[PDB]
Amino acid sequence: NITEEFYQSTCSAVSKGYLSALRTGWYTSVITIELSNIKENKCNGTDAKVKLIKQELDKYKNAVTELQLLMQFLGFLLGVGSAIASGVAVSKVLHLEGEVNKIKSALLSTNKAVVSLSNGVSVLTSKVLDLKNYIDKQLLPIVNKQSCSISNIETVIEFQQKNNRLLEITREFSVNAGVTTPVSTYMLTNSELLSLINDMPITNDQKKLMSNNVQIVRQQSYSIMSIIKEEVLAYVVQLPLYGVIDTPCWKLHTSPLCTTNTKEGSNICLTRTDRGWYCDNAGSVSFFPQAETCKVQSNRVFCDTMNSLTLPSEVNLCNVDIFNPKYDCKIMTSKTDVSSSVITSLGAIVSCYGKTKCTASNKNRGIIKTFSNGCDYVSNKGVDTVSVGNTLYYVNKQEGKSLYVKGEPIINFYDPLVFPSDEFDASISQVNEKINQSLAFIRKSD
Amino acid sequence: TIELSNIKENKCNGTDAKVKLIKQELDKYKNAVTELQLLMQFLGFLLGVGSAIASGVAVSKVLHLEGEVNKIKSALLSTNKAVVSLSNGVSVLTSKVLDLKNYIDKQLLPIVNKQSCSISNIETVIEFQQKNNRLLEITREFSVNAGVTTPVSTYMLTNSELLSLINDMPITNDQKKLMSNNVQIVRQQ
Amino acid sequence: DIVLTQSPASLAVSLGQRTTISCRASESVDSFDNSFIHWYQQKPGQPPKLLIFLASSLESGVPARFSGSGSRTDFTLTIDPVEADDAATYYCQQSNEDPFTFGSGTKLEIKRADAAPTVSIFPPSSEQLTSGGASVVCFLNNFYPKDINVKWKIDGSERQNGVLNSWTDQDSKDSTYSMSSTLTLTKDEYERHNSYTCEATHKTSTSPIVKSFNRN
Amino acid sequence: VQLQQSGAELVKPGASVKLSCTASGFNIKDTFFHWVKQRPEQGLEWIGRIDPADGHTKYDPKFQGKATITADTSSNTAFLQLSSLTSVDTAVYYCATTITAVVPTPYNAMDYWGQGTSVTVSSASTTAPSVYPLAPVCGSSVTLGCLVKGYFPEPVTLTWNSGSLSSGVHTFPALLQSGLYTLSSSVTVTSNTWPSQTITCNVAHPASSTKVDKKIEPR
Ligand SMILES: [Zn+2]
Ligand SMILES: [Zn+2]
Ligand SMILES: [Zn+2]
């Protein structure tokens, strides 16, 4: 499964076992709730049974009215999308004349139908709740039969269950301005969402993937309010569809790499800034700089190409030889020699500088390693916690073998006299350019 | 730990409103169990990268092993608090905060099989949905968060349960008094 | 474990009367509102058949001649009216606590009018005599009550060594018993004597029923 | 619906045996299974129960190590493995479930039972039966007999006229004498039926793979 390599030379680590599930595009469905506009109830009197049904009908009638009022490091390199552009684009089409009537007619006999909208796009539609028929054909008839003092108390409770979902939906949208993420259990129950996946135009491998991770799918989905014309409430559900699946993926962890002299100043530091998730797709490598935004379950990675850059395969060369000519690896430089630790998939990188106390501890044995100054690594095999200064990090206990690639720290090849100490997004070649400009200009004057 | 009974498929024919609620509730419960089974399967840049739940997950991983539950299950059969040593050697305290099994298997379902699914007293169905309610919210919170919740809600750990957990934590009275007077912050962390 | 004591261990009941069986529990077998006691009927050669579940619920397809009662530690099965088919053993069982436990059983016998046996005697088969063995079989069919005495006489003197007796269980239709008595000898010893006699002593007569044959 | 259990078993002392109980008419994933032991002239002993949906089992501790209950939903079959057998394990073993109930509980009554599997623990080898017809000595009705002597182990099956002659039949329980089993059966018909009509004793002994038919013939 998962493995890990720590490169001592550039103070970074690569975890390799993972598999992709990249969100590549969107699927939009139209969800409808058929609900009825009720005429004024003539049930006077405060008989205890009566007050409950009148109160419940009133909660429903207000909820409809409430709904009517409501309808009226390198992250900076990424670029700016519009998360709900697709679903909103579908939502606006539903406003056109007799589009609801088409949807309404399509779901008249079943609860699922494919409708060709006026713009030509065919979308799945679902009737997930039928309060129109329940109220008009079961509840109100029982009220007239029993003259509003219901003999059988269970029918009012049967209504209260049906009505709660419409009340929770109207409560959520009252607070979200009609666009929510993740999509709630009231908007789409778990069984409904699983059912939409079976009917989506994707391979069984994709259907099986989504069905086994509905909670991830749910979190990557949007719920867009659309209309309440006629007797219908309609909102668009925007689902992620994963167009790239099961390609190899790897995560890069990076930490500052500094010289190890104890004197307070005069230390110089260097950090790889390309930390994040890498997944090769379609002959290229997709890079996700904010690895927090990617969600991992088992050994499969769900990222979103909205948060990616599309890079040449040669990026991989930065891990093995940072100075290679084929790709200019991104680095940052400073004189701030602060101690910290980065917990990786299968261990921990410890950048220990200055006078910091740095230790690795076992749950049973106590402290079992004290670090020297510099960037080092420890496997999660014998180690349970790592303590850097006053910070105690627990280590990941995911199983897998890690291997330490010894090497001379890269920072030793720079002398502090010509080293450019404020560069936030420089490269291997860019630092050399500033060194040669600085090494010639100072030398030439003498 | 919450004690659950797995309800097998009920054979209730009939459209009497009483049956409709009982069957509606039993299926509602069965969905939650099925849902939970799906779940088992300026200077900020200088800070450094932790793994917030690496400790909790490490405990959670051990519980997946064959019959680790039986260790837990037998330890709490006679009390609601016990310390269990897991397979990896870790001794962790375990708490039984709710026993829904005994109500369902020995009070509800017996009355169902006895009265041929036609419940006489509507109070038992309202009793059921109230008994059932907390487990339904617990499963909702987990269903929307991919199984990891923060802050810890009152459905996950009631106020008295947490205050009791603090007493049994390996900490000084200064720590217990600190946590006990700021449960709402404790929940947030 | 919960111990269930059933009494009586056996009883005789006439057709059409009502009867009761008791089942007493060691500890209470109640949870909440329910008693987890069950009653099963078992006839020889078959698995048990469930009659009553929980305390008083009659299992579907079971005649409404069976009823159950009781609350905590004391339970009752009643059969009314008793029919000839009801001759069998009855067991109670609790499921309120693990392990599930069964009672030690109550055997119900149907009481009927006395009947003398129909006696048939059979000389050894020609194949068995070829095989070098010789068994004499005596059938005593459709009698009541079960208590009966059989004696084998060879040439007018009693012989007990080698007699093998097997009774059937009470017939579910006519409430009679049957039994098989086989006297097994060696072939050489069989054809050295002439008179083989089978004597059944039964309460249906003071003089025993005698069936015999002479080795032709 | 039907629960069909495997056939009778002869087991060497110290060896093991695995019994099966295959369900027809319903899917075992939807209920609970129990195994119950009944020794001859003994009571019923609950061995344990299983939920076939997830493998969860609960045993009477008396049987722990001795009894292992498993299930396979693929073949809709429940199993009982008995290990390291001694003579006190000679007994009839039953399968059971709740089906005649609105909601199946593991605490519900056992309303359906398999027919039982008869396990005999013995070192003795298998012995085929001798089948002997019993004609009357050389009234209005006549009684004929059939003697099945000296077989091992149980069971044997005996019918009359291939089962079409069932009324007036008495078949007696087998007994051990000198290490082997002996059983007999009588049939009573009107004296006008025999010897006019042929009457044949049918005896099958599966363990020795024998099946013979013996016509009753007058002496
Ligand atoms: Zn930590
Ligand atoms: Zn409790
Ligand atoms: Zn075996």
Author numbering:
A (entry chain A): 27 to 98, 137 to 510
B (entry chain C): 58 to 98, 137 to 284
C (entry chain L): 1 to 27, 27A, 27B, 27C, 27D, 28 to 212
D (entry chain H): 2 to 52, 52A, 53 to 82, 82A, 82B, 82C, 83 to 100, 100A, ...
What do the authors say?
RSV F is a class I fusion glycoprotein that is synthesized as an inactive precursor (F0) that is processed by furin-like proteases at two sites to generate three polypeptides: the N-terminal fragment (F2), a 27-amino-acid glycopeptide (pep27) and the C-terminal fragment (F1). RSV is sensitive to neutralization by antibodies directed against F. Neutralizing antibodies target six known antigenic sites: two of which (sites Ø and V) are considered pre-F-specific and four of which (sites I, II, III and IV) are available to various extents on both pre-F and post-F14. 5C4 was elicited in mice immunized with DNA and recombinant adenovirus expressing RSV F, and was identified by screening hybridomas for neutralizing activity (positive selection) and binding to recombinant post-F (negative selection), where each of these steps utilized F protein sequences derived exclusively from subtype A virus.
To obtain a structure of the 5C4 Fab bound to RSV F, an initial crystallization hit was optimized with additives and microseed matrix screening to yield a single crystal that diffracted X-rays to 3.4 Å resolution. The complex of 5C4–RSV F was solved by molecular replacement using the unbound 5C4 Fab structure and an unbound pre-F A2 structure (PDB ID 5C6920) as search models. Each of the three 5C4 Fabs buries an average of ~ 1000 Å2 of solvent-accessible surface area on RSV F, with the heavy chain burying approximately two-thirds of this area. The overall binding mode of 5C4 is similar to that observed for D25 (PDB ID 4JHW13) in that the α4 helix of F1 is clasped between the heavy chain third complementarity-determining region (CDRH3) and the light chain CDRs, although the vertical and horizontal angles of approach differ by 60° and 45°, respectively. The antibody combining site of 5C4 is balanced in that it uses sparsely distributed contacts to engage its epitope, forming hydrogen bonds to RSV F with five of the six CDR loops. The CDRH3 is wedged between the α4 helix and the β2–α1 loop, and main-chain atoms in the CDRH3 form hydrogen bonds to RSV F residues Asn208 and Lys68. The angle of approach of 5C4 situates Lys201 near the center of the antigen–antibody interface, leading Lys201 to contribute more buried surface area and more potential solvation energy to the binding interaction than any other RSV F residue, as determined using the PISA server.
